Amino acid sequence: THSHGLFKKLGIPGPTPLPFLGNILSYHKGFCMFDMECHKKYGKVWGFYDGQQPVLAITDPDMIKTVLVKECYSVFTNRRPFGPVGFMKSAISIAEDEEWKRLRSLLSPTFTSGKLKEMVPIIAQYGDVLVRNLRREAETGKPVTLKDVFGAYSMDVITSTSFGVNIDSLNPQDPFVENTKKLPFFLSITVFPFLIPILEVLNICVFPREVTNFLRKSVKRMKESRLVDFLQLMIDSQNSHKALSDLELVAQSIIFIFAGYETTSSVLSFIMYELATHPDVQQKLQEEIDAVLPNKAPPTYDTVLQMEYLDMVVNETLRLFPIAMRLERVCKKDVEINGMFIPKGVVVMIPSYALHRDPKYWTEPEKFLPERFSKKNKDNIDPYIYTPFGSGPRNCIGMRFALMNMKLALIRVLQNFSFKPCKETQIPLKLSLGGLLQPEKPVVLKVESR
Template sequence: MDFFYNALRKIKDEHNKKSDGRVDFLKLMIQNQIPDDQAKDETREQPVKGLTDHEILSQSFVFILGGYETTSTTLTFLLYNLVTNPDCLEKLVEEIDTNFPPDTPITYDALMKMDYLEMAINESMRLFPTAPRLERSCKKTVEISGVTIPKDTLVGIPTYVLCRDPQLWDSPDEFRPERFSPESKSEVNQYAFMPFGLGPRNCIGMRFALMIMKLLVVKLLQNFTVETCKETQIPLELNVIFQPKVPITLKFIPRSYKEKQ
């Protein structure tokens, strides 16, 4: 923890020195910083609004942790789904090799045109949602299908259950990226597939996370053939918090070596 705080403090100090006009989350927090003594002053009738140095560093750490853990978990599940469905993996590798021949730079526009890659990511997030449960506070009393939900009630949304409901999905336990093809995507009920949430409280980093995942998958499959190994658990079993009971273990073989065999 001290390592991260020291690193973040160094980044924060560098932001303070720069005046290049660029505004990011850290800059916005720094602009609203207040001295620690003002935050602790209990003699004021109204507390001073702002963030202390500790709060800025803590929030920055949450940004890093939230972005890293969720992305890495989603990528792990995606690779597992691909290697346990070799036909899907082969289609994706073919799409990558077609769009990015050797020595071709990976651009944002080209990544966004990778239909099968996006289909595979969406289908993997359906089977293993990054957030298996969402919570929202009801802002006013409403009645839905005869059920009254009082104002300020905390409502739990079981995204994992919705994504596996046979009334909403055909063969819900199967990995079928074609569900999210350009031709079929419009048939997907948006309230049955909410990997990043919905509405004004959806994940603020959604587009960035998707771009990073696409980039990492392309780079990985350009350079490695991914396969199951004797430690790979098939089928995958999850615990009560929807994490694998046994760590997902896969085998990575350099494509240059594989192609020589």
Template sequence: MMSFLPYFSAETWTLLALLITLIVVYGYWPYGVFTKMGIPGPKPLPYFGTMLEYKKNIILNGELFDAVSVAEDDTWRRIRSVLSPSFTSGRLKEMFGIMKQHSANLLNGMKKQADKDQTIEVKEFFGPYSMDVVTSTAFSVDIDSLNNPSDPFVSNVKKMFKFNLFNPLFLLILFFPFTGPILEKMKFSFFPTAVLDFFYASLAKIKSGRDTGNSTSRVDFLQMMIDSQKGLTDHEILSQAVIFIFGGYETSSTTMSFLAYNLATNPHTMTKLQEEIDTVFPNKAPIQYEALMQMDYLDCVLNESLRLYPIAPRLERVAKKTVEINGIVIPKDCVVLVPTWTLHRDPEIWSDPEEFKPERFSKENKESIDPNTYMPFGAGPRNCIGMRFALIMIKLAMVEILQSFTFSVCDETEVRRSPEQTEYDIIKHQYLNLLPS
């Protein structure tokens, strides 16, 4: 039998055996962390671990290394302190009038579709609305992307969220996870280079105009960063602007799409919400900021929609020191993933967790909700900085729509999903009827 094997010296066979052993060990050893810590969990595959289940959440940030959602420690604290004043109640109230201009465009676009007796692809309306609100309040750039879908801002944002499973960088990290930190240091990114270059160049041009005295009458997000006395670098300013576009567009439009879907599939809830709208704004009265903020049932409905479909299905945090929790030692620098989706649907926390029940968040009930079990915008000091901005934008649009229309399911509505699809996949191309109310 040995004659069929190549002739190698004993030293060569020893080295070959050692190499094979190392390859096998490499395939298993990195994925035994939970087992060593005594934490039960899914059984990892050799070489892959559980990464195949989370392929869409593997990120290389590239040029966005200094964005507020990515920066760490003192750099993060400095950037966050500069950005926080942009989202105070006073600032948001100033932006409300701008939001109303774009919600009017949204309503007109939806009305045209309804007049044709056609179904609407909800993301195709809420996406442009979110984009227009973000760019106008942040940089005083008015796109009207609903009527100009080929605008470079719109097309490039859409390219940003197209994930390629065969991206060489993704495959490299999938098979060799240790290369991730190295590539991160070298500023490699999963985000298309051309897209990032477009946004950095566009925003740099806008900023340059401000620096040379071509200012705007609006006090927008970009101008507040330029005027800050805490010294953001030019690159930091541009990174915050870019991440604001990406975050504001995708998360807000997705949340609105899920909300419309939940209303369409729960018509009794929609009727009750429309009754509150008619009480607060009788005879389709214009929406006022203060009154909108006092709509209790609207809050309940939106909170329940975010419980079922949180913006981030999971959160990621890094342990800054070694801690022991319930007998389990979490070492310093260990990455901790918080399964928001799972927490929000845990039957030990929520009764009938799969049911849409806005009353969970009524004044009488919400006080009993543990904030660590409901985290649609994250938790702690690194929660979503634009949370209040997003909520106002969503509430305004939804109230104006429901003043005139009613959502309902149609033949194209996907109420059930196939096993290989997630709800987040389906909502990208979800269809509903829009009927005059």
């Protein structure tokens, strides 16, 4: 301190920081709106402060490629630290430098296309659970809270694809549904991040210290009972890198569970909102599914990859609602990328949400228009502008699994039901002014049987 002269010095523009707070008062309308304003106010690069922490936004595709791919192992390797984490320091999304590179290696083969084709029959069976829990609400002409029913399915696939456990968590108190339920503080970190090590010597975990105590033992119950799913594929790996330890493995289990719980369910809710508020896209998708799977035939790994309009709908939804909002890398050395000095310790940020809604790359960016991703037009889309799964060595490892999971859900559900707005549906949907990509009011819709 005071780091607050850095961008003034480097000749990089940006909003003037308040003492201690930096620019965080500007987060009151949410990360997203702040980024969009800076992008129009300042242009291709700018700089702000989360407390004393300098953040350099970049929006040049080449420069973004340099950061995320070209200079990844050398400079922009780790994400911005947050804490206290405790033993979750060993989770892949959290770990750093060579220990991350190791965890990335030991867990990469789990996420292969071939391993994912063997999860399809299991992910298929809960697609049926999802339809019956839907019909019980459709036959009773009462509006439906999509996050609950998508959450219950997304919860079902996680427990199954990651440990073998098999519940219809919507309807009992099966010993597993509840510890995963615990699925203001985090803003006080930003002004006082010098207090993270304080909390790390106090063993306060941002992960409720009890959930983790439940699964550290629950895994070693499963580990010593067996002795097709993620835990097996990880136990099988630990049989050039030091093999995955037992606590290390639990920490990955925790990452996968959250990674694909609120994500899968949130995205599915954004897609169903768009398909209800655009009934022709919905009909057109329903037709393509009936063309590929006539007589409500069950989707397989290969018929899913055949559905091009389904892919367009998923991609365009993620353009509008990229649930990460930003990508970030901590610059670990004095570097120069594409003619611009970047001093060590700066956090480099890619404003994905702003870049997805930039009129300078998107005609009518607020409109939901799947055709942007027609095989005709899909080629003009800059892949360092549309980045819903990141890019380079540290992108979303669960990308293909998440696309596959969501699409199986949609096919099964669109085969059987159409989706209409209720009077209680929020149109236009508004994003949580807070810190997550979720709707302000939950998405509720009328569900009717075909």
